[PDB]
Amino acid sequence: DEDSLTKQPEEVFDVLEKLGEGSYGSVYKAIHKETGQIVAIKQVPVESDLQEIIKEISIMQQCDSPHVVKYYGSYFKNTDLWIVMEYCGAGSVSDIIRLRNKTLTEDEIATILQSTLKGLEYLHFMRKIHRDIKAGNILLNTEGHAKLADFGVAGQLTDTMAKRNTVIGTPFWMAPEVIQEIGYNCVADIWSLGITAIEMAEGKPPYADIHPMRAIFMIPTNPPPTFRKPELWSDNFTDFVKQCLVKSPEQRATATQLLQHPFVRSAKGVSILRDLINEAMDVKLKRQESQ
Amino acid sequence: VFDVLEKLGEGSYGSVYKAIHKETGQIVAIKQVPVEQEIIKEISIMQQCDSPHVVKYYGSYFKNTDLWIVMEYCGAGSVSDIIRLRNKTLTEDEIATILQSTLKGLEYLHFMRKIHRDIKAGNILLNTEGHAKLADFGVAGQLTDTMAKRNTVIGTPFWMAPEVIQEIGYNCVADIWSLGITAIEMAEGKPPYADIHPMRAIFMIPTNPPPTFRKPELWSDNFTDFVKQCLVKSPEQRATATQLLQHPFVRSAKGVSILRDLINEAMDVKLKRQES
Numbered sequence A: 001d002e003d004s005l006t007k008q009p010e011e012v013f014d015v016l017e018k019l020g021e022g023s024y025g026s027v028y029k030a031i032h033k034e035t036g037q038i039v040a041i042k043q044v045p046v047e048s049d050l051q052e053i054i055k056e057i058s059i060m061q062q063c064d065s066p067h068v069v070k071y072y073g074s075y076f077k078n079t080d081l082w083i084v085m086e087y088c089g090a091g092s093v094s095d096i097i098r099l100r101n102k103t104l105t106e107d108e109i110a111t112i113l114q115s116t117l118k119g120l121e122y123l124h125f126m127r128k129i130h131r132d133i134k135a136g137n138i139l140l141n142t143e144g145h146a147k148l149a150d151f152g153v154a155g156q157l158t159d160t161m162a163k164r165n166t167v168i169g170t171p172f173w174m175a176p177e178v179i180q181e182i183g184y185n186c187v188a189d190i191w192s193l194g195i196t197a198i199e200m201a202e203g204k205p206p207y208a209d210i211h212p213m214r215a216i217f218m219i220p221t222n223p224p225p226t227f228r229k230p231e232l233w234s235d236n237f238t239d240f241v242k243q244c245l246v247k248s249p250e251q252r253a254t255a256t257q258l259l260q261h262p263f264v265r266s267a268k269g270v271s272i273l274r275d276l277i278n279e280a281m282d283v284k285l286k287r288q289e290s291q
Numbered sequence B: 001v002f003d004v005l006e007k008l009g010e011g012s013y014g015s016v017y018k019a020i021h022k023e024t025g026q027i028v029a030i031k032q033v034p035v036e037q038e039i040i041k042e043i044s045i046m047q048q049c050d051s052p053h054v055v056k057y058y059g060s061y062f063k064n065t066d067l068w069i070v071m072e073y074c075g076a077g078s079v080s081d082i083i084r085l086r087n088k089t090l091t092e093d094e095i096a097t098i099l100q101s102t103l104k105g106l107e108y109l110h111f112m113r114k115i116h117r118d119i120k121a122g123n124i125l126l127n128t129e130g131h132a133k134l135a136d137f138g139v140a141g142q143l144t145d146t147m148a149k150r151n152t153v154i155g156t157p158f159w160m161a162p163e164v165i166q167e168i169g170y171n172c173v174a175d176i177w178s179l180g181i182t183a184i185e186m187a188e189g190k191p192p193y194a195d196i197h198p199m200r201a202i203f204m205i206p207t208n209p210p211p212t213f214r215k216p217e218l219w220s221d222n223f224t225d226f227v228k229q230c231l232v233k234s235p236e237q238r239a240t241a242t243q244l245l246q247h248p249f250v251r252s253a254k255g256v257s258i259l260r261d262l263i264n265e266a267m268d269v270k271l272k273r274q275e276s
């Protein structure tokens, strides 16, 4: 009766393994004991910038897209904030490359970036900049559907604010105009997508072995990066990356425009991700049999 | 050429492996970095240095496209690793002894017109005997007759001095600010602003008052004052390595013998984890 209303979070959820780091704390697999539903929970201590966390939650709540991780709700556990989210059972593309010790095929990249671009097209229409687009922040569910994750550093455009000027992101992936003092908008995410395309192909971004703070100073001045071995890759993939990595943000393609690029327009269904998913989660299950 | 063993970790800019010199049986560390000129800077600065408080340079080989740099091996690893492995922060007395050796390294570097620019627990090593040595000259800077200051914005954000972050030029005492943050890091387990985004922190350090301990009542007046003297915002006013070697917290520091248990526990937990 009245004993069901004050059940504490560690009584509602069965908390399992750490999945990785998020914006302002760690993320864990969990089961809703009642419904059997599986979820991800980011645990955030009270000494975090709680303004920014409410922003993240807010941006997630406003978004309703099969290409963006859903928000389910929040719980307090002592002073700790539990943020409860959609669980994607294959993990990040970063994890899947690491687990298999293999980069992705042109075909796998094409399909994943098409879903990623549909996410970006939704966000950009809703005047949201992600600002942290990389393989780390693109998730696959067991069915092979990609979802944008980690709105920790995301930015909002409004009637009175057509541009942001906050220098933020992960250096290697950050657009020149983000790094320079001038204001920027949604197409910053397209530059980051370009770097991510290279990251999935080659296993790391350009300048990956250089110091991050030396890279940030070079990106604005340097010509647009390209593949480490251009002759390995199709003309369509090479051109896709070239269209993403245009230095002038005014000239740079939109998510909508890039969805029509031959490399992406021609993309196969999620069925070509079946092997990639199965191998990854197999290597995961084997490594978990060291308990 | 030499017998390559386990990864020991990442540097700022390259992976580092244990190795044995096939000829002499001598044990060494090798940092592997691929090539896209600036790397020569690190090697150059390493060769110019000859100090028991700095990892010595042994030589270089290129293997495929990757340059392998051969360095002094310190068998206890980084202070960062030792705090993590034992899941314990360090006592005032352990910090005192380690930072005294660290300061003698800085005093040598600063006299040689070198700025390290990446001072943190990650980049302070102990050999098996418990002697501390400065590692990772990846982002290190050189002063000359016509260049009394650098202006390159570089380092690890949480640890970086305000004057380094601002466009104004800076000199050796940038390392002393970083040492202050490192003192807090070893005491508390993390730098200040640790639960903030790095790129938000970098913009706050110049404007914010000097960071302090999360729990002031836990720490001696000597340690509190040491950190306060390191974290002076004005680089002109900030103490030098030489001056801080005379600070009561450090001058009164015990021999390396108080590191014996810390070392033994750490390397034991390392050897156990390597059997799984």
Ligand SMILES: Clc1cccc(-c2c[nH]c3ncnc(N4CCOCC4)c23)c1
Residues within 6 Å of the ligand: A019, A020, A021, A022, A023, A027, A040, A042, A069, A085, A086, A087, A088, A089, A091, A092, A095, A136, A137, A139, A149, A150, A151
């Ligand atoms: Cl705030 C944040 C940031 C990145 C990813 C997630 C996440 C949500 N649902 C997930 N399912 C599986 N794995 C996830 N990650 C957690 C972060 O490390 C990568 C895996 C997630 C959450």
Ligand SMILES: Clc1cccc(-c2c[nH]c3ncnc(N4CCOCC4)c23)c1
Residues within 6 Å of the ligand: B008, B009, B010, B011, B012, B016, B029, B031, B055, B071, B072, B073, B074, B075, B076, B077, B078, B081, B122, B123, B125, B135, B136, B137
């Ligand atoms: Cl470039 C660089 C940066 C930091 C440390 C080393 C290093 C040299 N000799 C070593 N012996 C033992 N452990 C070492 N670790 C410390 C932990 O991180 C990896 C390198 C080292 C090298």
Ligand SMILES: O=S(=O)(O)C[C@H](O)CNC1CCCCC1
Residues within 6 Å of the ligand: A005, A012, A034
């Ligand atoms: O899905 S669970 O979190 O386990 C169940 C929720 O805690 C239910 N909380 C409601 C609060 C308002 C009054 C009715 C109950």
